[PDB]
Symmetry: C5
Subunit: 268 residues, 5 copies
């Protein structure tokens, strides 16, 4: 995306570097390569470790979404295996489950869940849900009432209620996990420290290479900038896993997979 | 080897650098190693981390398949332990669990499961399964009906129902975990340019190496190219552990083992 | 701060420039290759060290996230299981809110008396303040609420246990934070590092000056910034319960917790 | 100490380079160290990550056996605390649990468990175990039958029956884990590639240092080589956790510790 | 470690005065080779100290679980059997006994005084008879729970809730046992420790060509960095070693004891 602008600036920096090499020692400035080896290696080590942290936050995101599909699938399986006649509670619980997924998606994307929710629930409760500052948690509490009701109506025992309650728990952990990843980012000092350092390193590098490489510094220094810049750029494509880029999590696709999955297990 | 063809190319590029080395002065070419020491160390550091990430995908994928064997082994044990006489149920349930494994392998290899399914289940069921968006998930839900039936029949209590129920949860987690590794590759950005910049570094390397090595240049360049290139491609191999490469997982062996286990001696037990 | 030692590195480099006149006069040589070696080694160690510091930070944030999850689902279980017992709802929630603030005060080594008094009867405040661990005692109090529900027959051993597990989870959160605070790594991790990172940074100009001459301070400031930036960010991340910049907004996280629990039990602050 | 061969071949590889030295430049061949630092470092990085995998695998094998001891300790405890009257059942379950460990060791070493089985169990049960294609697994089935019938005899509720069933689940995870470790080495491509490069690098190296070290080539090129080889040999020393070499897991001693523990807990 | 630092300044002054005679013979020490060697040792020290750190972290987690399990077990006892203070005090004894006994076991020191202060000498003899005393303390703790269950004061459900806490301690015992027996590397740590030791002493000879009278200064700055990093992995590799820091294990056995007496109103002193 935005890297091409910074490598062409690096080509001109090299042109500026060759056209300026004659005036060099007259001013009194000597740039060997060896301290830039030190610096560049150092920057690579820190870039490597940072990029590690970023990949890990991306996979934790993806795991958290995998749990939603896992936990919702087995909740519905448990409903059918334990209460195979009660298709009325099936449809209601399933719609709260599908609501929860879509609501979680919209919450992380900071978008509006009204249509998805009205598509799935009566305005009777859709207003109760959006009346809360924590709508997705409220959907869980409502799904909780459903199994709670089947327990008090004697159709669930304490045991079988507990078996399903634990899947609510699993969805609660997904909710908190997602919220935690969304609010708490990879500390901003990483991008600030490394974006400066990397950008300044690629810019100062030609003036250090020209002593030894002469007319060829434009090439090998755009090379070195390319790998540093794109390694660094891939960290930022991974640190916001809930964003919209094609390189991010296809959250719409996953919510669709979830809905068709639960609607499949219900015969719809 | 995708490496054997490139390795030779690097030999030629190495030949070109030595024949046309003293001519550097005419065209205006100086080329030190130190900029390529730096560049190459950075690429090693990044190769190392990427390879680390791919092995993690390998071991998780191995692990997830490990749990199928475990969870199925113990669900059959619980049936033999709690309903020792219910052999028609034992037989029915084992067939679904063996279907689960083969079905999952096919799902992850994008191959057809119909042959394996019919080998193991009634054809009415082979069509209920093949009809679904997710057949592995349906095989699970049918396995859960069998123990759900024994529970309506009073043969299982809620407690012992839950004990067997938890093993089906365990398999749902394998299914989900396997889809996550399938459905999401690692970002192709990683693959898109990390493999080109390794090649690029590899071919240019002799052009900066000759001045110090002279004749010894084709050897040392191909050595360096070997290590960097085998590392990069091994990483891309283990990234797709449900693939069919030589270092991917033996999914077919593993389903065989699962099958042989659950049908150990006609499915007969003490 | 960090900007002070950056400045002194600019000083140390002009000291190098002026006393370069006298280098082999006094009998002095300083190539850069040895400092490249030392420099890279320190980079590697800073790389690993820093990675462990981030891991502690993520764990602390994760632990606090579990407070919210567990407390949410405890209130959820109370409402689904005992929809009528609103006094218990109110008392448990006031304990679970007391737990969060008391944990914040614990981790910050501050007095929890104000927040406790806001939230609970003074006879309980005194009980909680007497304990070598107020958060532990608050969990026990919460545990008596559901336990008394259980003696009265309103909870079964099963549904009592479902809720007990949540208190178990908070216990684990308590120990996890206790363990992250009560365990600074042996001071070797920092006086190997921030001593050597400091020392390396200010000797680097003397070694850089033969190659670079008047340029010394610029590269020397760049290398020193890079190393110092990395090394200081490590020190912030490893005390995540402190008051520094990159440290958990524990008061915000508590307010979110209280508001969530007030939300689920129909109350408006 | 399979390693002292290549250290000494290195010493003579440096002497060959000492004598062949000035035949170089009209032969024309030159070797500086700079490109070998590049390679040497790149290999050190790859050696580091590989040894890392090799170490995690040894730790997992040690963990797995560790929890055999944990889960059988606590399963025997539960039997004491819940059925203190029933020392006959105590002694049967303990022999199955001791048998499981021995059988799991034999399995992993591919040795005959028959003598150990016949020392712990009635020959009727030995016959059933050895008839299975998965003897260790079939030992768990038999142990589960013990507690299974204590359940049908009403001496265990479903609750306490389930408390002990979970310990058999834990042993099931040990068995599968060990089988998995046993058949899933660190991929061969790893150690295959490193050995070709680490070995080739260690012999070519003195050729590239005599130009700089002259007469001291051996003492420095051997010291560099001991370092890569001993680091790469640590991987070999950690590759078969279940074998019988000195650096492998003392599985016999662990199996004796397990038996000793379970007999301390039942007064034998 | 400081002794090996001052052997390095010696080796440096040797390398200065003897640099004269060196190449009358023809012995060269450049710096590029020792740079390649030192970076590789730095890299391996990086991964080694990573492994060591993880062993140290797992050790602190296991001990943390002791405090967690023992707190929640005693909380469970109070919330579920509020009246049974005699049982409260017996079980708290075993839990506290278990902590000190685990610590003594790990540091191979004598548990007898801690045991004789916490439990009756009939149970001290029983515990001290076993070859696995910490396990025997868990088994004893189990009997207390089991008797409450046979007396019908615990249901199988609520008996089971407390049983899980004992498993948690069982897991801690085994984990700690495994982290003790081990070094997982079978004494290679001695090979790679003296590899740092030798590199640090040949280093001033490789540096004197470039640095002359300055080499003792740059050579030991480097050596301090490498030796401190090594000795630190040595400290973390062995979190129960017979020359470790006992402050936190003692601190933890004291915290849990104090917590438990607090939780059972044996603190504070009555009015
Ligand atoms: Cl689940
Ligand atoms: Cl299992
Ligand atoms: Cl929860
Ligand atoms: Cl256990
Ligand atoms: Cl007995
Ligand atoms: Cl399990
Ligand atoms: Cl071996
Ligand atoms: Cl006994
Ligand atoms: Cl606990
Ligand atoms: Cl008491
Ligand atoms: Cl009390
Ligand atoms: Zn689950
Ligand atoms: Zn239905
Ligand atoms: Zn209806
Ligand atoms: Zn709107
Ligand atoms: Zn399992
Ligand atoms: Zn059968
Ligand atoms: Zn030539
Ligand atoms: Zn939870
Ligand atoms: Zn209420
Ligand atoms: Zn366990
Ligand atoms: Zn007995
Ligand atoms: Zn072996
Ligand atoms: Zn716990
Ligand atoms: Zn009491
Ligand atoms: Zn006290």
């Amino acid at each position: 995306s935005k890297i091409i602008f910074r490598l062409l600036l690096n080509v001109l920096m090299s042109i500026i570097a060759i056209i300026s090499y004659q005036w060099y020692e007259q001013l009194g400035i000597h740039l060997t390569v060896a301290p830039f080896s030190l610096l560049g290696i150092a920057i690579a080590i820190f870039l490597g470790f940072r990029n590690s942290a970023s990949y890990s936050r991306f996979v934790e995101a993806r795991n958290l979404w995998g749990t939603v599909l896992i936990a919702e699938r087995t909740l519905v399986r448990q409903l059918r295996n334990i209460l195979p006649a009660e298709h009325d509670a099936h449809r209601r619980i399933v719609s709260y489950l599908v609501a929860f997924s879509w609501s979680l998606k919209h919450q992380l994307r900071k978008t509006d869940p009204t249509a998805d929710l009205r598509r799935l629930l009566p305005e009777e409760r859709v207003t109760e849900i959006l009346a809360s500052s924590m709508p997705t948690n409220r959907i869980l509490l409502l799904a909780g009432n459903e199994i709670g009701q089947l327990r008090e109506a004697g159709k669930l025992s304490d045991i079988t209620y507990g078996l399903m309650d634990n899947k609510l728990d699993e969805l609660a952990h997904v909710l908190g996990g997602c919220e935690r990843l969304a609010t708490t980012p990879v500390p901003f000092a990483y991008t600030l420290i490394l974006q400066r350092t990397v950008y300044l390193f690629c810019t100062l590098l030609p003036f250090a290479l020209v002593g030894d490489l002469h007319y060829m510094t434009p090439f090998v220094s755009v090379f070195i900038s390319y790998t540093f810049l794109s390694w660094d750029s891939l960290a930022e494509e991974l640190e916001d896993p809930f964003g919209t880029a094609a390189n991010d999590l296809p959250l719409n696709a996953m919510c669709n997979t979830i809905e068709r999955n639960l609607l499949d297990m219900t015969g719809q």
